[PDB]
């Protein structure tokens, strides 16, 4: 779209690379620092999608 | 409608007669790069599914 199509998502953050021919549609807040990622988001807290 | 990369959909084909040469007119693609078998002799081998 001229405004922009935002309907397509992808995964960026994971604990490790997955094996060939597997999928994972689970959504959770990745921990990217010593500060715990209890919920929502924050510094050193990344939403992978 | 096509699925997203993180939620790709698996579609199965079984118990039919295929013709891998009719797909040229379906979409305006050019490369059709293939790995394990030559595109020349796709309609001669017999698969499982």
């Amino acid at each position: 779209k001229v405004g922009g199509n935002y309907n397509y998502l992808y995964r960026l953050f994971r604990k490790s690379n997955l094996k060939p021919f597997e999928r994972d549609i689970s959504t959770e807040i990745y921990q990217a620092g010593n500060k715990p990622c209890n919920g929502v988001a924050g510094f050193n807290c990344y939403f992978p999608l | 409608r096509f699925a997203s990369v993180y939620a790709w959909n698996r579609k199965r084909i079984s118990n039919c007669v295929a013709d891998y040469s009719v797909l040229y007119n379906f979409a305006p693609f050019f490369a059709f790069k293939c790995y394990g078998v030559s595109p020349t002799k796709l309609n001669d081998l017999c698969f499982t599914n």
Epitope: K1, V2, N5, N7 | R1, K11
Partner: antibody
């Protein structure tokens, strides 16, 4: 819902017909316009669509070549052009518009345009 | 390509009686709730009736109800009215030979 569409005309064989489809009545979260044709006594059948902001038409199987889809300089008013009318060419031509993006069901429809072939 | 078949061809029932129409699509892999219903009174253009499997659009009363899944779909109506003289069609937005059904010619006695 009530997009302004051109009225009916009477045409002789071999002439040309111009049909417009005004759009500015409402607000649209889409970038396409569609056309629907109906025979005088039969059902509905599609012909194609053109992409707004690109001006690229798309034709169906049995409605290629002779039909012409055009847009406006503002890319809002869509015009339909046909030439070399036949005796069986008489039908009604509608103009359908999408509701939201990637929602391929038509909600906004023009009132319809009638084309008659006679002498 | 996906093509519909619709029966019965025509309907002639007095107003106020429940009626059911079936639209079946001949597709090996099905449609998966990608169907819509349309109502076209003589004269004016067809107006949207039901989009999706059963959801209703804006400005339509809750009189109409629909159901179906996979390959077969059925429409149920109640409290038929005189002004509902129209021919009902079904459309699949599943592939990109966009086509319509054969239609059901519903007549008010």
């Amino acid at each position: 819902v009530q997009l302004a569409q051109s009225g009916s005309e009477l045409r002789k064989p071999g002439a040309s017909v111009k049909v417009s489809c005004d759009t500015s009545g409402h607000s649209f979260t889409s970038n396409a316009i569609h056309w629907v044709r109906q025979a005088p006594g039969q059902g509905l059948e599609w012909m194609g669509w053109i992409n707004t902001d690109t001006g690229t038409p798309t034709y169906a199987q049995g409605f290629t070549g002779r039909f012409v889809f055009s847009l406006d300089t503002s890319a809002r008013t869509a015009y339909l052009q046909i030439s070399s009318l036949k005796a069986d060419d008489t039908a009604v031509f509608y103009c359908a518009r999408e509701r939201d993006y990637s929602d391929y069901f038509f909600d906004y429809w023009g009132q319809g345009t009638l084309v008659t072939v006679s002498s | 390509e996906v093509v519909m078949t619709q029966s019965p061809a025509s309907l002639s029932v007095s107003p106020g009686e429940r009626a059911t129409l079936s639209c079946r699509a001949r597709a090996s892999l099905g449609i998966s709730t990608d169907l819509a219903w349309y109502q076209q009174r003589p004269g004016q253009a067809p107006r949207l009736l039901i989009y999706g499997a059963s959801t209703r659009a804006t400005g339509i009363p809750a009189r109409f109800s629909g159901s179906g899944s996979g390959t077969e779909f059925t429409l149920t109506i109640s409290s038929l009215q005189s002004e509902d003289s129209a021919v009902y069609y079904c459309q699949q937005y599943s592939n990109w030979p966009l086509t319509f059904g054969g239609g059901t010619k519903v007549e008010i006695k």
